[PDB]
Subunit: 236 residues, 6 copies
Amino acid sequence: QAIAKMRTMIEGFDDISHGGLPIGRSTLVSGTTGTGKTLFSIQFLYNGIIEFDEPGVFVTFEETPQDIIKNARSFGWDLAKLVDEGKLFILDASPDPEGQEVVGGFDLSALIERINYAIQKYRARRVSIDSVTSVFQQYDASSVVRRELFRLVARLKQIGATTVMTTERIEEYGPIARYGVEEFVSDNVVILRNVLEGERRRRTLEILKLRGTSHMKGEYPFTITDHGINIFPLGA
Amino acid sequence: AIAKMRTMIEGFDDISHGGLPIGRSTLVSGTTGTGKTLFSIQFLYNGIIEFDEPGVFVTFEETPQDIIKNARSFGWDLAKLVDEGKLFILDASPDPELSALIERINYAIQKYRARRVSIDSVTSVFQQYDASSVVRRELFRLVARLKQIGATTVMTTERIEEYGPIARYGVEEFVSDNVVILRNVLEGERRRRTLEILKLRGTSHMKGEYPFTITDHGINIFPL
Amino acid sequence: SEHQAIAKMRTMIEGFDDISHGGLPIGRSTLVSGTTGTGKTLFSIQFLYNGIIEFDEPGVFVTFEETPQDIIKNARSFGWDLAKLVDEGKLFILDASPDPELSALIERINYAIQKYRARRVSIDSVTSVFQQYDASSVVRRELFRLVARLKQIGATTVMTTERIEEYGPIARYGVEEFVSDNVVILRNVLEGERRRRTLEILKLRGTSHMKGEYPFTITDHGINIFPLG
Amino acid sequence: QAIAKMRTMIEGFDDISHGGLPIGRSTLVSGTTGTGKTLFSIQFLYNGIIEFDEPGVFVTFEETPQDIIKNARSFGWDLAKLVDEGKLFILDASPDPEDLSALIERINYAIQKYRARRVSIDSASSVVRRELFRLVARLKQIGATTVMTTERIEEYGPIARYGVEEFVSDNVVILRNVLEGERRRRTLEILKLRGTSHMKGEYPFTITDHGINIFP
Amino acid sequence: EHQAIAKMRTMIEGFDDISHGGLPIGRSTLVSGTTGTGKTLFSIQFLYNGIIEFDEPGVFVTFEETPQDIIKNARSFGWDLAKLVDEGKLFILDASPDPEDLSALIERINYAIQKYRARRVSIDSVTSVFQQYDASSVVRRELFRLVARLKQIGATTVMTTERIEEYGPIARYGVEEFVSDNVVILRNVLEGERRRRTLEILKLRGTSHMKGEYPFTITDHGINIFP
Amino acid sequence: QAIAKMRTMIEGFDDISHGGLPIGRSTLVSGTTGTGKTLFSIQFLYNGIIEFDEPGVFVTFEETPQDIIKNARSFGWDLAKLVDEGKLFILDASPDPDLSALIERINYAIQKYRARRVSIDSDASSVVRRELFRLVARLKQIGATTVMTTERIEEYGPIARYGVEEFVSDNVVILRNVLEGERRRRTLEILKLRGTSHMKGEYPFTITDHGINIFP
Ligand SMILES: Nc1ncnc2c1ncn2[C@@H]1O[C@H](COP(=O)(O)OP(=O)(O)NP(=O)(O)O)[C@@H](O)[C@H]1O
Ligand SMILES: Nc1ncnc2c1ncn2[C@@H]1O[C@H](COP(=O)(O)OP(=O)(O)NP(=O)(O)O)[C@@H](O)[C@H]1O
Ligand SMILES: Nc1ncnc2c1ncn2[C@@H]1O[C@H](COP(=O)(O)OP(=O)(O)O)[C@@H](O)[C@H]1O
Ligand SMILES: Nc1ncnc2c1ncn2[C@@H]1O[C@H](COP(=O)(O)OP(=O)(O)O)[C@@H](O)[C@H]1O
Ligand SMILES: Nc1ncnc2c1ncn2[C@@H]1O[C@H](COP(=O)(O)OP(=O)(O)O)[C@@H](O)[C@H]1O
Ligand SMILES: Nc1ncnc2c1ncn2[C@@H]1O[C@H](COP(=O)(O)OP(=O)(O)O)[C@@H](O)[C@H]1O
Ligand SMILES: [Cl-]
Ligand SMILES: [Cl-]
Ligand SMILES: [Cl-]
Ligand SMILES: [Cl-]
Ligand SMILES: [Cl-]
Ligand SMILES: [Cl-]
Ligand SMILES: [Mg+2]
Ligand SMILES: [Mg+2]
Ligand SMILES: [Mg+2]
Ligand SMILES: [Mg+2]
Ligand SMILES: [Mg+2]
Ligand SMILES: [Mg+2]
């Protein structure tokens, strides 16, 4: 009765992970700016819908929904259509253009409930939470958001949602995650890197850990192309 | 594909696969004397001269007098463009002796019908001690308004190591759509300038570092 | 070996009893420190599991991170049925994990140890209760009250701790090596895009032991260590 | 109308800077201890007086005027003679062996009094940035061409002390004294000259009986 | 008298050669090193050899470990410390943390030295006493008060303390500022995946010594160096 | 009339400093523990007395006078005799088991003993910089030639501990004890001498029964 996995259908990832992401748990995807974390979290939901008719909920802390949609057009992923069809729900949690300092955790209490009803309403099995770093920066990484983040993770587990959460790190080789996000999103960790090779950049993906199950180890090269992420498990 | 505006900075539109996405902001970050101000001036100058797209330059530390003077190093006559109403330099530099400023920047953009905006040294208004939440929200307020207005913006930021964080306060990469890094790396005893587009949302682009020079004609980048 | 001063119990974790020259010192505590995903929880589960299966020695597992349910689910990765051992009274999993929405815990632990007549104890991620900037004196005294009680009871204890870098301090709070009798380090070193797992016994009070790093794997049978020499 | 420059006449520097220091602006000269900062700032003034009859003001915060004068004897320069002729003024802003608005109009008074064209100023990051910003602006309005020295503690670390001084400076020169394999090597770099060209990278120099000698 | 400082033999094989005669008499020597380098072993061997070889009584002040554990672990080297305690030649002074006023502590150390007529003293884990008071400079020059007082009685003292890196600062918390006369560094260096133990005498005020690192092993007879 | 020097009579040191230590000024001697700083400062005073009959004052903050005397017996030097003769004074400022008060004690000793040589053995950087500058300023005003030691943590790292001590000193000497391949190598470097020339980089030295011997 060891943990089962959900296929991401992201080229090469299901091989590295030996079958996909552990079902009903959160996986942290951490990486410097521009490593492809958001793209990964979108491809996860998009493939869920197209391949499996599994609805997805995308919670956005950094980008607006309109920009999420616009930026995916270059891959030929018609997110607007999936939203119109009710297969994808983009929950806008991104900063107020007229944002001010507010007190409490009522806003993140209401967020978790908003996320829960979205999941219920759209019958979603897949969830992406994009840019945990950003909501941490909204509350100066106070123990208030740390607690709420933990509450969010537990609720998702309680719901049975399979979740990707993305988060920033500052160096290619250094800590797993800025603000130690892996403490709360702790079951599974994937690290994306964008490493200088001479003057060129080489992207790699690593599954550092998946609790309760097996996976390939170390870094595997990938590219981002017109079809999104392509990872090469046998790549040079 | 998303619509891009040509910078006409030699080499840059090839590296960005057509120029800067219209209606969005781009961070240009670098150590001192890497060519950030020059990039942001050239962006406006070319827009006016080649495409008749008016420009607003917001300066937070250099005075407009020095901006105009330093631009004559490249044979650019910015005073003439200001006299013609094609360029507006907005002085936000401090007296030797931000919400409000945002409305003034809005006003200038509509008044001059500007499509291009450059913001130089905006983080000099903050202080080392400020909470990241405050710095981020105050910067975001400005950038969100520019996006709402339709402007395409270059915003310069500072860094203190050539390989190290993107910018000084650790929030700047979250407020802009795109990220460009200018470097000035020591190789033995020689300096080499490079430009890298680190992040360009919604499009492919050339990756890694590309050498450039600053000459009498401004920035020239060599992608091959 | 016969001629060493400290009595030891066998972990039965393949290769560890060779590296430690007989197993873990009885009645004492052993720190197992490592970056995240090095095998700390697996080591501390395997210790209890083997004690029950091989020697019928009951065990108490104190969890600060994972829920008991997840401990049990994850252990199925290795074909271990922990729920059955809990139902039989041979294993007790003590939940000290964060509630969504230390003296007290010590008494609960002591009660569980006497109730289940446990000889083996694993404390997993105890330093997760502390805050990053809590005083060193505070963290050391808190850990020590726990560990001294366990020694007084006569339990043999594995206590896991976190570290941030593979080559760097023994543990995160810089006091952990002072409350423990023995120190073991698990590493997961990344070099040339490949990871390799190793185990080292850094300090074992009162006896010799093999020195340096030894390779190990995690497979469907748990930890396997390969001691060369 | 691109910025004009003033010749330093420091052997090799006017080649590296394509003509000297930008007129009416301040140039930061930063370096670890004993890199030659005070020497550069004195040669600047000295050559101004001797070669071009341009009066100079030297602002000192730690070294006494007499120590400054004494040390310049090392290079065969008679500063006391120039002070007696009124072609050099050393301004003593040192503390006593038991507020920059004040110091500034002291400098300004001295500039107007001695008809000075060259100034040298020898030796919480938010407040330093703002304070150096204001000092730079005040000298610019007076029309002085200024060398200001600053300290740093590593050869390839921060340019100055707080990581901000280089950003608020129009011009930046870095003096290094790098230790490699038990040997020292002095170099000068013009890192930035806003609004004009200059040679790039480090150039070796020596300090001898004649002052700084740079080899382009 | 009017002579250079004299030394007392440790009888730790190899060490009396490296130190040209032993530890400077009537002064403190800091022995620093990462966890598990052999500091406590050095400090016990020093006292044990004094008792067995010279009939010089010893006092062992313990800040980290319990006396029961110190005695039990010393059996690893064939040393019967309980017998020496029973015979009054060794006193172990317990200052380890309670499982639940340092001026008073110094006075008890003094009293013990006088009661047992000890000529050798070991102070184990200065780092630990620092962690109990959070490196407040109340512990720091209460430490100097201890070093001073030891020097007044003419005790010859080993003080052990922790460091974090093999090639980095001499001692965590800057302990070498107080136990400043003599400094010995024990290292456990990683050579690939193997460990190599070394001992260095960094400094002995007022006298000569060999320089750099010397490898050693820990055996069933304690520390064994070879120059 | 450039700055003159007084001989240390460590023959290698007077060779690389071209004559000795600059007269009437303070020289910072920095190094990790056990590099020979105290020995350098004592040898400076001892040679001054034995070779030139220049009395000396040694100011101690850590070691007791009795220990300074005992330790010097390692080199066959009888400092108790020199104290008894009134050629040397060891001023005890070490703590029991106010910068102005210390300075007046130093001044009083220099007058009492007619001393020409002084050695001084051993939070905010601003405070340190200002106190150290006042100490240095008074000694210079008194006429003393001073060696002042400081500690540092790394062989190749900051010169002293507050990042300011080296900028307040006229002269800087760095002692190193570098560990490489399990062996130690001692070196001495004159980093800076204001107003005068000197050899550059690291020079090997040893400490023997004879004290410091430098071998260019
Ligand atoms: N005509 C020219 N020819 C060559 N290089 C020039 C010319 N004019 C200016 N420069 C260079 O351009 C640099 C100034 O670039 P600038 O855009 O001011 O940099 P920055 O990154 O904004 N630096 P700062 O804001 O001062 O930290 C100077 O340091 C010169 O090296
Ligand atoms: N006649 C000379 N020949 C050679 N070198 C000399 C001569 N006179 C002085 N020097 C050198 O000049 C250096 C002093 O330069 P100086 O301009 O005082 O440096 P600085 O960078 O201002 N140091 P500081 O202000 O104390 O941090 C000395 O350390 C000597 O190495
Ligand atoms: N059509 C495309 N082809 C290739 N690369 C693309 C395309 N669209 C976007 N990208 C790349 O994706 C990057 C942004 O990925 P994203 O997932 O937003 O990064 P982050 O890790 O910062 O979340 C851009 O910097 C660009 O390099
Ligand atoms: N059946 C299996 N085969 C191989 N590896 C496994 C298996 N089950 C778990 N693992 C590995 O064990 C690791 C779990 O380690 P864990 O003990 O939870 O680490 P820690 O407690 O140090 O964070 C996983 O990250 C995974 O790599
Ligand atoms: N009989 C023995 N043979 C070899 N090594 C031993 C023996 N007994 C103990 N040890 C070693 O002694 C080390 C502990 O020494 P200790 O002096 O307590 O270290 P420290 O005080 O520096 O942490 C143990 O980690 C083990 O390596
Ligand atoms: N007779 C001697 N022969 C060789 N070396 C000696 C002699 N006497 C003392 N030393 C050395 O001098 C060093 C003491 O130097 P010292 O000036 O006290 O160092 P610091 O003040 O830099 O800590 C001792 O560590 C020892 O190596
Ligand atoms: Cl790619
Ligand atoms: Cl260039
Ligand atoms: Cl493995
Ligand atoms: Cl030179
Ligand atoms: Cl050994
Ligand atoms: Cl030597
Ligand atoms: Mg993203
Ligand atoms: Mg600029
Ligand atoms: Mg674990
Ligand atoms: Mg100077
Ligand atoms: Mg010990
Ligand atoms: Mg000393």
